[PDB]
Amino acid sequence: WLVDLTTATQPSVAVPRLTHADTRGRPVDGVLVTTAAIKQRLLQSFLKV
Amino acid sequence: HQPLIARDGPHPVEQPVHNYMTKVIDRRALNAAFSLATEAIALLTGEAL
Amino acid sequence: CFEADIAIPSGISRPDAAALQRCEGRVVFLPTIRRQLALADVAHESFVSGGVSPDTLGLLLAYRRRFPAVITRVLPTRIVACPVDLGLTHAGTVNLRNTSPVDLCNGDPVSLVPPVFEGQATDVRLESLDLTLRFPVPLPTPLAREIVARLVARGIRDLNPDPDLNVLYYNGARLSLVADVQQLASVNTELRSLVLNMVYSITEGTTLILTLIPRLLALGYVNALLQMQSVTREAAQLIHPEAPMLMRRLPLYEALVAWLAHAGQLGDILALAPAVRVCTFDGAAVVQSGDMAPVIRYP
Amino acid sequence: CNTLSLVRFLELGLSVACVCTKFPELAYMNEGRVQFEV
């Protein structure tokens, strides 16, 4: 369910030139704002980073 | 500049519309305020010392 | 003063922009006094109260309810109005657009309905976002109280037919109330509910008092002093009306509150109280139609 | 009054793999024969 929701949209006409890293090298391409209540039961059952 | 998969067969020819589409910026307020009492007007200026 | 901003919505045309250039100095009504407002609180489409378009009653309920604002400077993306109802008395001079009478050096002008004048005059419509700004008419207190009681009197002769009420001279001018060709047939259907209000509050009370006062005085300082200042007035009205009309206490006193409840409605409805004053400086003391006037805050 | 009127694009790499052979330069040609001997 998430993985299509992860890419139902399409990438914008945008290169930021200032990227948010992943401590290795990896650039971040999404945000996924959620509520506090949903984020709890989502993380502990659908692993993790 | 959208791609073209320019076709075989006698179906007529593809045509690149490299159109300029515009958008429109909104305007927002974002207002904030704070009180100041009847005293501290002579104070913070230098009157009532 | 405390200038309040009304937000211009998205894409309008240049005549819609020029429609915003023919309104610099009008009168605007708004529900709340938030420092940033939108155009959705302004339009005549924001006056719906029962799912239908309001009448001149339904406007004058809101015209006595919500708050006047006068646009000093027009803007792209904003509307600056320094509102009247905020500020101390006789401060914050503002500027209005006159309509056909004078607005003399005094008079304390009053906002009121458009269809007492030309209905599709000052009903300025935005074409792009498709809304309607029906600006009220600023009439001074004597003539504003004059014309409001004439058309409802003209509504009576238009109600159940068989002089001509419409001449009404001003100090100099002859004021043509009748805009005949298409307006007056729309007049008696847009003051339609309102005439019933001026009637039913008269038919109830007079037919209540003529079974109140005969039921009073014998059911004593108010007794003999009832007709003391009403000698040959109320007994004469008891002689005239009770003869050519018809003639129960527990529904009666129940009807006593209900009529007088409707009476307290109409006093807030009618009589058009002054809100802003013309008392200018160094003017010609006499304003003309389409010309500005320095207008000061409180009556 | 703004930029970002730019997108970029190309497509190769797999554009030769599925193709899985190629003769380039066909001249003015009339008939192409390939015969099989099994």
Nearest CB to B20 within list D5, D7, D11: D5
Cβ-Cβ contacts under 8 Å, A13 against chain D: 4, 6-7
The rounded distance, in Å, linking the Cα atoms of C5 and C82 is 9
3-class DSSP string for B1-49: CCCCCCCCCCCCCCCCCCCCCCCCCCCCCCCCCCCCCCCCCCCCCCCCC
Cα distances (Å, whole numbers) of residue C153 to C89, C143, C145, C157, C266: 36, 15, 13, 7, 16
The neighbouring-strand residues paired with C133 are: C124
Residues 6+ apart with CB under 8 A from D12: none
A21 touches chain D (CB under 8 A): no
Put simply, the chain C residues between 73 and 92 with a CB less than 8 A from any chain B CB are 77-78
Structure tokens at C205: 């009370």
CA C267 – CA C264 distance, rounded (Å): 5
Please give the C-alpha separations between residue A32 and each of A3, A28, A38, in angstroms, as whole numbers: 12, 11, 12
The residue type at C296: I
Q: How far apart are CA C292 and CA C278, in angstroms?
A: 11
CB within 8 Å of C24: residues ≥ 6 apart: C71, C73, C74
Secondary structure of chain C as H, E, C letters: CCCEEEECCCCCCHHHHHHCCCCCCCEEEECCCCCEEEHHHCCHHHHCCCCCCCCHHHHHHHHCCCEEEEEEEECCCCEEEEECCCCCCCCCCEECCCCCCCCECCCCCEEECCCCCCCCCCEEEECCCCEEEECCEEECHHHHHHHHHHHHHHHHHCCCCCCCCCCCECCCCECCCCCHHHHHHHHHHHCHHHHHHHHHHHHHHHHHHCCCCCCCCCCCHHHHCCCCCCCCCHHHHHHCCCCCCCCCHHHHHHHHHHHHHHHHHHHHHCCCCCCCEECCCCCCCECCCCCCCEEECCC
Cα–chain center distance at C103: 17
Virtual torsion, Cα C221, C222, C228, C229, nearest 10 deg? 130
Sign of the torsion angle spanned by Cα atoms C255, C258, C264, C266: negative
CA separation for the pair C197, C270 (Å, rounded): 11
Q: Tokens for C150?
A: 């004439």
Going from the C-alpha of C133 to that of each of C11, C74, C120, the distances in angstroms are 17, 15, 11
Chain B adjacent subunits, 3+ CB pairs under 8 A: C, D
Distance CA C111, CA C122 (A): 13
Q: Which pair of structure tokens corresponds to residue C169?
A: 């001279």
What is the Cα–Cα distance from C296 to C280, expressed in whole angstroms? 8
Nearest Cα to C298, choosing from C29, C4, C94, C42?
C94
Distances (CA, A) of C44 to A20, C114, C115, C132, C133: 50, 11, 13, 5, 6
Q: Are strands C79-83 and C4-7 parallel, antiparallel or unpaired?
A: antiparallel
Q: In angstroms, rounded to a whole number, what is the distance separating the alpha carbons of residues C230 and C237?
A: 10
Instruction: List CB contacts of C267: < 8 A, sequence separation 6 or more.
Output: none
Q: Is there an interface between B and D (3+ Cβ pairs < 8 A)? A: yes
Q: Which residue has the tokens 């009197």?
A: C153
Which residues of B touch chain D, with CB atoms under 8 Å apart? 1, 3, 20
Across the A:D interface, residue pairs with CB atoms under 8 Å apart total 4
Tell me which amino acid residue C122 is: T
Strand partners of residue C69: C28, C83
Retrieve residue C71's tokens.
């646009």
C122: left (phi over 0), alpha (psi -120 to 50) or beta: left
Residue A7's CB: how many other CB atoms inside 10 A? 11
- Rounded (10°) angle between helices C192-209 and C141-157: 80
Q: Which helix (H) or strand (E) holds A4?
A: helix A2-6
Identify whether the C-beta of residue C74 lies closer than 8 Å to the C-beta of residue C38.
no
CB C135 within 8 A of CB C26: yes
